[PDB]
Amino acid sequence: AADVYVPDEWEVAREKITMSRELGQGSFGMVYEGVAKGVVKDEPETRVAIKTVNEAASMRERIEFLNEASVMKEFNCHHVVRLLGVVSQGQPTLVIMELMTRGDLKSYLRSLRPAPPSLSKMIQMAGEIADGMAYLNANKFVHRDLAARNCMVAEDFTVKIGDFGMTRDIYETDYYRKGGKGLLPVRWMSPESLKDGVFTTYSDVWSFGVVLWEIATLAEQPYQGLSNEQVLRFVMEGGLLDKPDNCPDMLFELMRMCWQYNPKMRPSFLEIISSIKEEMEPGFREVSFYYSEENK
Ligand SMILES: Nc1ncnc2c1c(-c1cccc(OCc3ccccc3)c1)cn2[C@H]1C[C@@H](CN2CCC2)C1
Structure with a gap:
């Protein structure tokens, strides 16, 4: 038994995401504008925002980051910003x-x-x-x-x-x-x-x-x-x-x-x-x- 973040259908291969610019920093780390492949049904490519952690070496920040992203997995509302994916395996940890x-x-x-x-x-x-x-x-x-x-x-x-x-x-x-x-x-x-x-x-x-x-x-x-x-x-x-x-x-x-x-x-x-x-x-x-x- 374990209580770590478990990769699921939201997981995205690292190679499918590129970053192109800074959008700014709210909670956790810098948010970047970029592109993700295979995140929207019947779109080959999607323009996305990509969120990082602030402190690379912090496992606690990492776990908290992913727990908070996991909350968004439940949300499906035109008037709430949607989660599109997660890169949890290896560093850096990414939220798409x-x-x-x-x-x-x-x-x-x-x-x-x-x-x-x-x-x-x-x-x-x-x-x-x-x-x-x-x-x-x-x-x-x-x-x-x-x-x-x-x-x-x-x-x-x-x-x-x-x-x-x-x-x-x-x-x-x-x-x-x-x-x-x-x-x-x-x-x-x-x-x-x-x-x-x-x-x-x-x-x-x-x-x-x-x-x-x-x-x-x-x-x-x-x-x-x-x-x-x-x-x-x-x-x-x-x-x-x-x-x-x-x-x-x-x-x-x-x-x-x-x-x-x-x-x-x-x-x-x-x-x-x-x-x-x-x-x-x-x-x-x-x-x-x-x-x-x-x-x-
Ligand atoms: N989707 C987006 N598209 C474009 N730009 C975005 C976003 C989000 C963005 C949108 C929704 C949710 C979100 O946090 C969810 C979350 C929470 C916890 C863990 C992981 C994820 C970030 C923030 N920014 C910008 C970065 C700038 C921050 N500034 C404005 C005041 C300081 C604005």
């Missing part, structure tokens, strides 16, 4: 993913600053993100680091849920580190996450509210002008982000619902999609988790 050609949502939103995104465009982004999150929550996954920087933009401008590795510790389920060296995205965090480190579908809804505010401000810094320590206290004392200039009333109203102090008073992602579904593009019905037979 759907290439999101327009980069991260935060960088995208910043690029639109000098007309600004129309309400309809904003709603469309919101519903796509909420749909991805509804799928994940329905599959018992709590993202914990939802933020524009961890949503990704497709060639066709579809927003999809991305990097969830930044705040996952290797030992967390069995062991606690006293005090805590853990990374905490405080400006995106619910009062109960700030208080006790509790992360649920409800705290993901809180972060979603902050992503809406990022969309409406074109990725201004939430609580700009407060330190990290000041944000933590401010939000735990019931502080809220202000309504952005020229924010459509309906969007701010959504933020307000997501930012109920008590987690049980917050909408679910399904309830958010429900409230905005009529303002989504017609194609949303055909690609969404919300309208799929999985949504039961």
